[PDB]
Design a protein around this ligand. Structure first.
Ligand SMILES: CC[C@@H](NC(=O)N1C/C(=N/Oc2ccccc2)NC[C@@H](Cc2cc(Cl)ccc2OC)C1=O)c1ccc(C(=O)O)c(N)c1
Ligand SMILES: *[C@@H]1O[C@H](CO)[C@@H](O)[C@H](O)[C@H]1NC(C)=O
Ligand SMILES: *[C@@H]1O[C@H](CO)[C@@H](O)[C@H](O)[C@H]1NC(C)=O
Ligand SMILES: [Zn+2]
Length: 218
């Protein structure tokens, strides 16, 4: 998160920190959020060979009793996920156990307006990931403001962030929820490599039928 501020610890108890393993290189990370005691929603571009989820964290380098470290047993990536057009960037992760509900861990059930995104991602173009969960408020834009992304499609995606400001999600914030009036409306998907807003978020409402079908059959 660029241009944001540190979240009050444990004030977003649905936030998941994801550590992604691949076979050919070192670990990477993304965000995501708990929608069921055993299901985390995140972006499909965070897929990997295996993933570990930390719930209940603030400072991700300081282990505490609120932590719940859970294994992911199966990744369900959207079947039409497309790395050419960048569409359908969405994935559910089935947890090996159901998470405990505590004060620090809980689920989040289901243009012009201000919304909030949160993450442990880089705080600057050339900066490391943040140790602590950060958040920022961002303006929802008319779809015209994302025209320069050639494969942007207003039906599938949200255009997020006022170009006149420097506030943005960045690397490591992938998969984090965009909340508008306490409801998850988007997931961080992609933007410019220089972070100039706006950025493109997955529009959660278009994928509700697909979410429901995975959650009902597992
Ligand atoms: C795990 C995934 C990996 N991230 C990553 O690829 N991206 C690029 C990316 N790919 O998006 C796709 C790809 C295919 C289909 C649809 C969307 N999306 C977002 C991105 C971060 C980002 C987000 C926003 Cl809002 C604006 C710009 C921006 O990056 C320049 C990212 O991390 C990654 C790569 C590097 C790091 C790192 O810490 O160096 C890291 N924590 C994570
Ligand atoms: C996060 O925790 C570590 C290890 O306790 C501490 O060094 C660091 O300053 C904390 N970072 C914060 C509050 O940014
Ligand atoms: C991605 O979308 C493009 C343009 O619609 C399509 O032609 C392509 O086959 C799709 N699938 C993959 C795997 O690129
Ligand atoms: Zn704590």
């Amino acid at each position: 998160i660029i241009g944001g501020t540190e979240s009050k610890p444990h004030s977003r108890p649905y936030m998941a920190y994801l550590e992604i393993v691949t076979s050919n290189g070192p670990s990477k990370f993304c965000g995501g959020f708990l929608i069921r005691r055993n299901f985390v929603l995140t972006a499909a571009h965070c897929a990997g060979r295996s993933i570990t989820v930390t719930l209940g964290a603030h400072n991700i380098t300081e282990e505490e009793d609120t932590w719940q470290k859970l294994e992911v047993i199966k990744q369900f990536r959207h079947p039409k996920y497309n790395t050419s057009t960048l569409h359908h960037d969405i994935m559910l992760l089935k947890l090996k156990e159901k998470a405990s509900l505590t004060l620090a861990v809980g689920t989040l059930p289901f243009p012009g307006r201000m919304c909030r995104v949160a993450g442990w991602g880089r705080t600057g173009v050339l900066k490391p990931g943040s140790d602590t969960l950060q958040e920022v408020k961002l303006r929802l834009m008319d779809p015209q403001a994302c025209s320069h992304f050639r494969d942007f499609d207003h039906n599938l995606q949200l255009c997020v962030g006022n170009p006149r400001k420097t506030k943005s999600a960045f690397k490591g914030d992938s998969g984090g929820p965009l909340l508008c009036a306490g409801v998850a409306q988007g997931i961080v998907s992609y933007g410019r490599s220089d972070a100039k807003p706006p950025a493109v978020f997955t529009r959660i409402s278009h994928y509700r039928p697909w979410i429901n079908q995975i959650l009902q059959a597992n």
